[PDB]
From a paper:
Dissociation of U1 snRNP is thought to be triggered by the DEAD-box protein Prp28 (4,5), acting to disrupt the short U1:5′ splice site RNA duplex or remodel protein–RNA contacts at the 5′ splice site (or both). The 588-aa Prp28 polypeptide is a member of the DEAD-box family and includes the 12 conserved amino acid sequence motifs that define this clade of nucleic acid-dependent NTP phosphohydrolases. In the present study, we demonstrate that yeast Prp28 is a bona fide RNA-dependent ATPase, albeit with a low turnover number. Prp28 comprises two structural domains (referred to as RecA-like) that are splayed widely apart.
We grew crystals from a mixture of SeMet-substituted Prp28-(127–588), AMPPNP, MgCl2 and 10-mer RNA oligonucleotide. The crystals were in space group P3221 with two Prp28 protomers per asymmetric unit. The maps revealed Fo–Fc density for AMPPNP•Mg2+ in the active site of the B protomer, but there was no electron density corresponding to the RNA. We conclude that Prp28 can sample a broad range of domain orientations in the absence of a bound RNA and/or interactions with the spliceosome. The adenine nucleobase, in anti conformation with respect to the ribose, is sandwiched between Phe194, on which it makes a π stack, and Thr198 Cγ, which makes van der Waals contact to the adenine N6, C5, C6 and N7 atoms. The eponymous Gln201 of the Q motif makes hydrogen bonds with the adenine N6 and N7 atoms that we presume confer adenine specificity. The wide-open domain conformation we see in the absence of a bound RNA suggests that RNA engagement is needed in order to trigger domain closure and capture of the triphosphate•Mg2+ complex in a productive orientation by motif VI of the C domain.
Residue numbers in the entry:
A (entry chain B): 134 to 468, 471 to 583
B (entry chain A): 134 to 588
The structure:
Amino acid sequence: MGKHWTEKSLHEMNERDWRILKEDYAIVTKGGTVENPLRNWEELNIIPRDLLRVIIQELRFPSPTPIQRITIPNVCNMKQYRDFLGVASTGSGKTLAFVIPILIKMSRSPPRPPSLKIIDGPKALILAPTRELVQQIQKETQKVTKIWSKESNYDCKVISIVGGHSLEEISFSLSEGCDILVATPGRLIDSLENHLLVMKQVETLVLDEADKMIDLGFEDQVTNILTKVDINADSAVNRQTLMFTATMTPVIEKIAAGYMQKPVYATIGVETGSEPLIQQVVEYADNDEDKFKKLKPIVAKYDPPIIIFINYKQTADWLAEKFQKETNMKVTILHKSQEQREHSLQLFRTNKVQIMIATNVAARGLDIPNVSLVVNFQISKKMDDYIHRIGRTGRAANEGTAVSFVSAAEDESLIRELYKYVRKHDPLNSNIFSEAVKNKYNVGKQLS
Amino acid sequence: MGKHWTEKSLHEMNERDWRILKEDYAIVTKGGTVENPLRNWEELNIIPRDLLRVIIQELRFPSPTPIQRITIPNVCNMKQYRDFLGVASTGSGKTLAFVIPILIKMSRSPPRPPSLKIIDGPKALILAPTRELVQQIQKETQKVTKIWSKESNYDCKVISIVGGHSLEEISFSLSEGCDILVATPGRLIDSLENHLLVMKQVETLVLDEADKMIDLGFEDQVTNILTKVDINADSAVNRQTLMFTATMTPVIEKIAAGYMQKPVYATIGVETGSEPLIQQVVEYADNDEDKFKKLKPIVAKYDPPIIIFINYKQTADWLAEKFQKETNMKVTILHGSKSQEQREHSLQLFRTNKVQIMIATNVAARGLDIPNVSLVVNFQISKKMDDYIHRIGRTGRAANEGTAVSFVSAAEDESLIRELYKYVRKHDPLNSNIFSEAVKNKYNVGKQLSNEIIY
Ligand SMILES: Nc1ncnc2c1ncn2[C@@H]1O[C@H](COP(=O)(O)OP(=O)(O)NP(=O)(O)O)[C@@H](O)[C@H]1O
Ligand SMILES: [Mg+2]
Ligand SMILES: [Mg+2]
């Protein structure tokens, strides 16, 4: 029997219950002395009644998202205002995961008079990599703050600073001061350089999609901003730093290490991203004859262009022979064979020829058209190559199929990786991984 | 003996004369096969008559500046359109130093019709860190190109792109084509990424105030642009690169290595490094008591060691008594007339924190091993700026953040306060320097309105 965590009250929760809840929302943490995630909005009383009413009654958000669950109780503690690093993909309530703590923090002090907002600048600074993201964050924030202003004592001003707005307009928009400022690093820097604003009173600094900011070349801009806010800070100000990234990198570690003080580290969900629409089908075949006999009826069912990958030029030639003499399909080869190979590609792109049989080397950096079918006649040594290969189909929202023949002579570790992959990336719910391959390589037998 | 270079024809100049001329304008060069600098605008006939007329009569520059002297003959040098790295301050006249060569180069081909400018993009691209500089550069260039356009068939469009510009506005600005594009790097990247222009034909690329571009954080954007320019160039396009900086750094060196080919290197004047990260604070005070009253909360918050400068020894004794009576800071005094033993004792107390505050008169601390201090206080400013600069030198040493606080009364020389305001406005690495309104009003200094919304 038992009693499930959703049936318990807070007191009754044990450590196994917390483990289960964390798994339930794919939250993984570390850093020591980590607060448990919210079970709901209400019970810890972290969120003040007015704000809570805005969230539950006005916006109708009955429950927190995972990232909000873990972020809010770790970032809201008058005790610590501890730093936070979250690894989570865009969306799923990330923005309010950090905007809610900023509001809570604001509501634990009397409202700043307007004149003071003008003299002192923002209490929160949010950095994001693009104008679009910045504007999206401002709107998502004002969604709450616009209502909150009508339902409480706080009149929160959200100003954004982005490319495409003159220094003059930025300066004008700052006329009634600012509580939360949202900016791209570049334009924020342009703004400081022209003395448009002071940031001596910033209590929460947020770095959102930090990996994307690094990717776009903003590392030095970001670290300059961090250093500048640290130096210019009023000494009575205590500043909390929050960082969100979809992935972890050496650069992100470097920044965390350099600018954050003993932070909570959390992973939330998995790294999201594009799923090619591919049916992966892995089948066992003893030798090249068996392979070809299984392949023949498959190609009969797929519209050209079709591509077949091999590893040895001899096998390519053999396979072309088989196709030419045993079906009515026109092929073309690719090694180390042609420099005018773009002739062949041109045959293929225009459907003069239906099947291309190519090695990895020969086909890398060629514009292959979207194919209906990839055949891995000989498996690659590296998963990188398998992924690049099968990527030749399933592009631009069309469905594709990738069939791979696995013999008795393949790298076991590779086959393990491939099994995991075929299970994990199954958007069409139709991926096949042969039981015979499972047996030959002792892989994928275990139940969940 | 020998006749002085100013008395000679160009063809009579020997190597010693060139050495002397270069020392006269503080020009130092390397990189091999460096051309001699201009002795005047006219001699060499590098600059065509109409353009020279504009420069002298219209822009009012009868003589070239040192950076112009060395830059122009090294980048306008058929046969080789050589790359160039100049180390020089604003405002040493850099702008014309690179604009003159761009125009001269432009004048060698027929004007392009707008449709073709659009198809191929600018012939010259100039990068600068701020809107203010980009707009300056565009204005200076346009003074010439306006004239060139009215008085000849050369329409030559000089477009600026800055961070503040919407894609709409950039589009409209680019709508009749562009010959010289002056841009901030981030926004240039946004423009390219949105297909607002191309860059197949950039023959001259100028990176102005490159050290500042790096300091603001733009190294990757600049690199990305250099790369894109080089990648999209037509085959027959030779791209000449000029880079100007106020200081030399390993990053600048690295960019020169990666993106320039056998450049001429030149330094004008005494090369300086980065500015000490000192915050300078100038504050008003009616008298000494009031100075001390403002000083109490200040020395309460800065970590020892702290150094305080005065002009008269009597003031040192006074100050020391007040520190003893009103603070918990212990002090040592150098007034100038103690033994080297005593002065070394004092200095030892100071270095080992047995005392927190050293009080020194104008030259009592010169030549001694004063540790880096967190705070320098000018209790009585010196009569001369040299001493001010020397004193604030005691802080912000070795890449540290430093603070210098000066109190002025109404008894100072007005010209000194004027110089001081200039110095405090000019040297503000941290954009945090404070020059009190009280001092401004009392001396009628720094009260000139800019007549600009932003500047
Ligand atoms: N706890 C919550 N419960 C329900 N919905 C929420 C919660 N938090 C946020 N949302 C909303 O769920 C939607 C999807 O989340 P998310 O993608 O993060 O928002 P967003 O993309 O930043 N804002 P938007 O572009 O207007 O959809 C948004 O409209 C959020 O405001
Ligand atoms: Mg969304
Ligand atoms: Mg770097």
